[PDB]
Amino acid sequence: HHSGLVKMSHPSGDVEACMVQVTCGSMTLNGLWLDNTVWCPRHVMCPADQLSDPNYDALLISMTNHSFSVQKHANLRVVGHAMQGTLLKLTVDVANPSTPAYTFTTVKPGAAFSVLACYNGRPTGTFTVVMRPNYTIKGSFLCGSCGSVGYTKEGSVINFCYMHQMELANGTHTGSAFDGTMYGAFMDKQVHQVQLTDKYCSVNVVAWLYAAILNGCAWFVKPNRTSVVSFNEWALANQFTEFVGTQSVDMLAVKTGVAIEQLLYAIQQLYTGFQGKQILGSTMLEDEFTPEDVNMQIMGVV
Amino acid sequence: HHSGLVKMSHPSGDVEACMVQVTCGSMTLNGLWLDNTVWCPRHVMCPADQLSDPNYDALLISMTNHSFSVQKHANLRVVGHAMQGTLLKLTVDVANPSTPAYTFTTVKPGAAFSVLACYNGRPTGTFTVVMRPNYTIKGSFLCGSCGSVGYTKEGSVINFCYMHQMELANGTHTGSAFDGTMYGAFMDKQVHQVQLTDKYCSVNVVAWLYAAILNGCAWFVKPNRTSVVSFNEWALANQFTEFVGTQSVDMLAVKTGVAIEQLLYAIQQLYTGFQGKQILGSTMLEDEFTPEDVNMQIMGVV
Ligand SMILES: *[C@H](O)[C@H](C[C@@H]1CCNC1=O)NC(=O)[C@H](CC(C)C)NC(=O)OC[C@@H]1C[C@H]1CC1CCCCC1
Ligand SMILES: *[C@H](O)[C@H](C[C@@H]1CCNC1=O)NC(=O)[C@H](CC(C)C)NC(=O)OC[C@@H]1C[C@H]1CC1CCCCC1
Numbered sequence: 001h002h003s004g005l006v007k008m009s010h011p012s013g014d015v016e017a018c019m020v021q022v023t024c025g026s027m028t029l030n031g032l033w034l035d036n037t038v039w040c041p042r043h044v045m046c047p048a049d050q051l052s053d054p055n056y057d058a059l060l061i062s063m064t065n066h067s068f069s070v071q072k073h074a075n076l077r078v079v080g081h082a083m084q085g086t087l088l089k090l091t092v093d094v095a096n097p098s099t100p101a102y103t104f105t106t107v108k109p110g111a112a113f114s115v116l117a118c119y120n121g122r123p124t125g126t127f128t129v130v131m132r133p134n135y136t137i138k139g140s141f142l143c144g145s146c147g148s149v150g151y152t153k154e155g156s157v158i159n160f161c162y163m164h165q166m167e168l169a170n171g172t173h174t175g176s177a178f179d180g181t182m183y184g185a186f187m188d189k190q191v192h193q194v195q196l197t198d199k200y201c202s203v204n205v206v207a208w209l210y211a212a213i214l215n216g217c218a219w220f221v222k223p224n225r226t227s228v229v230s231f232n233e234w235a236l237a238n239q240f241t242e243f244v245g246t247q248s249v250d251m252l253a254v255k256t257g258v259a260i261e262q263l264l265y266a267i268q269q270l271y272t273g274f275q276g277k278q279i280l281g282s283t284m285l286e287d288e289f290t291p292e293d294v295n296m297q298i299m300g301v302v
Numbered sequence: 303h304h305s306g307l308v309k310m311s312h313p314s315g316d317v318e319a320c321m322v323q324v325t326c327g328s329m330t331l332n333g334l335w336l337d338n339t340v341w342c343p344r345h346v347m348c349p350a351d352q353l354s355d356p357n358y359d360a361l362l363i364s365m366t367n368h369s370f371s372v373q374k375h376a377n378l379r380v381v382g383h384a385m386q387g388t389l390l391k392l393t394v395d396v397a398n399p400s401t402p403a404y405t406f407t408t409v410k411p412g413a414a415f416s417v418l419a420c421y422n423g424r425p426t427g428t429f430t431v432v433m434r435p436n437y438t439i440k441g442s443f444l445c446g447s448c449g450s451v452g453y454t455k456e457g458s459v460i461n462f463c464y465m466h467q468m469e470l471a472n473g474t475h476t477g478s479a480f481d482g483t484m485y486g487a488f489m490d491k492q493v494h495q496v497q498l499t500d501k502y503c504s505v506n507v508v509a510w511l512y513a514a515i516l517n518g519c520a521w522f523v524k525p526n527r528t529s530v531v532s533f534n535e536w537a538l539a540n541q542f543t544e545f546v547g548t549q550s551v552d553m554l555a556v557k558t559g560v561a562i563e564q565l566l567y568a569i570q571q572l573y574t575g576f577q578g579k580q581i582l583g584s585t586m587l588e589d590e591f592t593p594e595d596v597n598m599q600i601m602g603v604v
Contacts, residue, residue: 002473006442007308011418011425013315116313123313126428140308140599171304171517215473283585297442 003215003280004298005289009114009128010153017098020076021121022090022147023069030118030147031070031090032163034099038070038090039178041146041165042083043188051190056083073121085180086188087163100158104178107161109133109241110201112290113152115162119144130204130288133241134196135184136172139164150175168195202235202243202267204287209263210252211294212280218258219277225261226268234268248291255299305517305582306600307591311416311430312455319400322378323423324392324449325371332420332449333372333392334465336401340372340392341480343448343467344385345490353492358385375423387482388490389465402460406480409463411435411543412503414592415454417464421446432506432590435543436498437486438474441466452477470497504537504545504569506589511565512554513596514582520560521579527563528570536570550593557601 022031022040026047031040043051045059045067060083068090070076080091107113109131117125117140129137129150141148141164150162165175165188172195176182186193213221226234232242245260253260267285274283295301324333324342328349333342345353347361347369362385370392372378382393409415411433419427419442431439431452443450443466452464467477467490474497478484488495515523528536534544547562555562569587576585597603 002440004442004473006429006431006440008419008427008429008442009311011315011318011428012313013318013425016313016315117310123315125310126313127308127310129308138304138308140306140310142599142602171306297444300444 001215001217003211005211005280005293006297007128007288008293008297009126010151012114012116012123012126014098014100014158015116015149015151016123018096018100019072019116019118019121019123019149021071021073023071024063024067028120029144030121032147032149032160033070033072033076033092033096034102036092036095038076038078038092039163040088040090041163041176041188042086042088043146043165044068044088053189053191071121083180086165086176086182087178087180101156102158102160105152105159105161106177106179107131107150107152109135110204110287110290112293113150113161115139115150115164116148117141117145118148130201130290131183132172133199133201135186136168136174136195136198137162139173141167141173166190168193170195197239200240200285201287202231202240202264203246203249204290205267205285206243206249206260206263207252207291207294208286208289209266209279210249210256210258210291211289211298213256213258214252214294214298215280217280220266220270220279221258221262222265223262224265225259226265227261228264231261231264231268238271240267240271246291248295251295251299251301252291303517303519305513307513307582307595308599309430309590310595310599311428312453314416314418314425314428316400316402316460317418317451317453318425320398320402321418321420321423321425321451323373323375325373326365326369330422331446332423334449334451334462335372335374335378335394335398336404338394338397340378340380340394341465342390342392343465343478343490344388344390345448345467346370346390355491355493373423385482388467388478388484389480389482403458404460404462407454407461407463408479408481409433409452409454411437412506412589412592414595415452415463417441417452417466418450419443419447420450432503432592433485434474435501435503437488438470438476438497438500439464441475443469443475468492470495472497499541502542502587503589504533504542504566505548505551506592507569507587508545508551508562508565509554509593509596510588510591511568511581512551512558512560512593513591513600515558515560516554516596516600517582519582522568522572522581523560523564524567525564526567527561528567529563530566533563533566533570540573542569542573548593550597553597553601553603554593
């Protein structure tokens with residue numbers, strides 16, 4: 001049996017129309033052109049020899065407007081520049097005529113978003129990831145991908161939440177929000193940095209166990225229950241996020257007739273082992289699908 | 303460690319600009335508007351009471367041009383209609399001004415393609431799948447999704463390979479090629495149909511074991527080797543596709559210094575069990591990534 005679950009991204013066309021190339025003569029990376037503003041990682045200003053301890057304030061001072069070359073695949077004349085956190089805000093003389101309705105938001109651990117991977121201002125692929133509890137994502141990015149963007153979509157409105165910055169020693173990725181902050185405790189410097197420990201996203205594991213029930217797979221469901229408070233105490237000792245219920249989880253509980261606390265108990269038992277059994281073809285807990293994924297893909301509920 | 307592998311779809315914008323809604327008064331589904339032609343599943347002509355044994359030849363005869371309502375989210379005036387296999391070809395009076403460069407191709411088992419899931423002519427998500435050895439895909443489709451399209455991209459050229467038709471009793475999906483044939487032995491009738499048995503895609507399992515080596519994970523590699531001929535004899539007895547090497551696999555062998563026949567032996571041993579170990583965080587063989595995925599995402603080679 002197939003669960004009906006796939007890694008589903010938003011259609012990317014509206015964001016593709018916003019991608020540009022930004023060059024400073026050292027690095028080339030991607031930017032996001034909205035209205036009269038082009039957003040891009042500030043390490044475009046960095047010569048390669050200084051990526052390990054850049055002094056971005058001094059680099060910024062050393063630039064003028066024509067230090068930046070912006071191209072859409074048009075040349076966009078830069079008429080202002082500023083730095084916000086780990087991002088540059090370039091003002092250009094032409095408003096993007098394809099600017100979608102948009103907001104800037106921060107994504108929280110466990111939540112999914114879509115990524116448009118771009119190289120040299122050209123969109124090359126799209127994928128979806130969940131923000132990990134340690135503020136990394138398990139992405140697919142190579143040299144030249146910085147400035148690739150992550151977003152969610154509410155209706156017609158694109159909520160931009162991520163601009164790609166760097167790969168960590170363990171192959172995971174991180175980037176900035178459009179307030180210029182890096183996710184987590186990371187710095188946009190190419191040096192060893194402590195990485196917080198990752199954790200299983202409990203709410204998403206619950207979502208996946210509900211997807212299993214919705215597919216007729218419920219061997220792991222017993223009358224036994226663990227309260228949210230008790231589970232969260234356990235979680236802190238076992239590399240699980242604390243569980244916080246949402247209306248999307250509640251909708252899964254209503255549809256299946258299985259209580260959240262029954263699946264919190266199940267998780268505690270499954271964590272110790274699947275005892276040779278499988279759940280939706282897996283022998284380990286899956287936390288890469290959200291309650292909203294399950295509601296939308298299996299139940300049709302957005 | 304993260305492998306650097308994700309399920310990567312093409313950017314969807316060029317195909318989004320080709321999607322329309324087609325209605326006959328019973329069903330509404332999606333169509334693909336290229337040049338002056340709109341392609342859509344022929345069961346748009348079907349009243350719901352007849353989806354189990356439709357007589358499509360008689361339905362076709364009963365239609366006229368204005369039996370079909372085509373809308374882009376514009377109304378497109380239908381000025382000709384024809385049936386090719388399980389698809390209708392509607393001729394419209396306006397050429398799609400956003401028609402990309404395109405071809406029609408058939409996809410083969412093990413190969414990946416991108417899907418744009420659409421409802422009521424509106425793109426709603428994108429995902430990637432591999433064509434299974436039994437000519438199904440493990441997709442995510444609900445009522446109203448027929449006419450959603452699958453495609454690959456070579457350069458600027460979109461190779462359309464799939465138009466969605468139906469869900470099978472086991473939750474998997476199938477559809478047609480743009481020559482009008484259904485993939486596999488399936489019929490576009492809503493009745494019980496025998497499903498061929500699925501198999502592990504050996505070439506993709508080899509690709510994934512190479513991705514593991516490229517990530518520093520090679521515990522399963524021994525000097526022991528199994529020839530292609532011997533492996534393929536084994537595969538026929540063990541629900542594996544026969545292995546056929548390609549230049550993309552050869553490139554992985556060259557980069558890692560590990561021979562194909564070493565990984566064919568590894569597969570034969572791993573099939574019987576991982577003995578408590580993991581490979582790229584999995585306890586079972588993974589066949590949803592292609593040699594080309596591994597070359598592109600990990601090595602940068604398209
Ligand atoms: C921008 O395109 C680029 C994206 C990276 C490149 C490879 N994959 C990606 O996702 N980002 C960078 O090159 C970034 C630049 C700094 C933020 C200024 N540097 C980066 O990602 O470097 C990666 C290497 C692994 C980290 C340094 C090691 C850490 C562990 C100790 C040894 C050094
Ligand atoms: C078109 O949008 C639609 C897509 C389907 C609906 C649900 N998920 C999908 O992917 N396609 C159909 O509705 C299709 C129409 C026929 C081809 C004319 N019918 C379809 O997919 O029916 C699905 C149900 C499961 C199959 C019938 C059972 C088979 C096993 C025995 C019992 C009947």
